[PDB]
Design a protein around this ligand. Sequence first.
Ligand code: CL
Length: 148
Amino acid sequence: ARHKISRAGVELIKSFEGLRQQASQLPDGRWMIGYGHTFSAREGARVTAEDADALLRFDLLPIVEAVNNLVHTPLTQNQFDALVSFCFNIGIEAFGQSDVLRRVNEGRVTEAAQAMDNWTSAEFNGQTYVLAPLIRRRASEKSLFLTP
Ligand SMILES: [Cl-]
């Protein structure tokens, strides 16, 4: 009973990303393209929205694996899709250790959704700042997560 990210799930994730049709260089010298893709992005590469979709699905493969491996309770497709989006955003390591995952594994779906509110801030020299984009992101993830 392994889950796959649905097309709707992919579109949700893409909705938080900006399409870059042309490879741009990062500080560390690597190249980025599509929806933040780097592993096969090279100097001078160009992508269509179709190509960027394919690359995003490559980047999501280890997230899909992680969520399947870390969640022991049964999930609905919507729950899985939202958790993949969430896990993609915060990273597998943080997801593994998260309040969200703990709740999910306890069968406390509502509390899992609420736990996502803990993931809406960044640190600047030890101070916490709420990120408006993460509030928007969390609202969308939580909505999907809690749709039957
Ligand atoms: Cl919300």
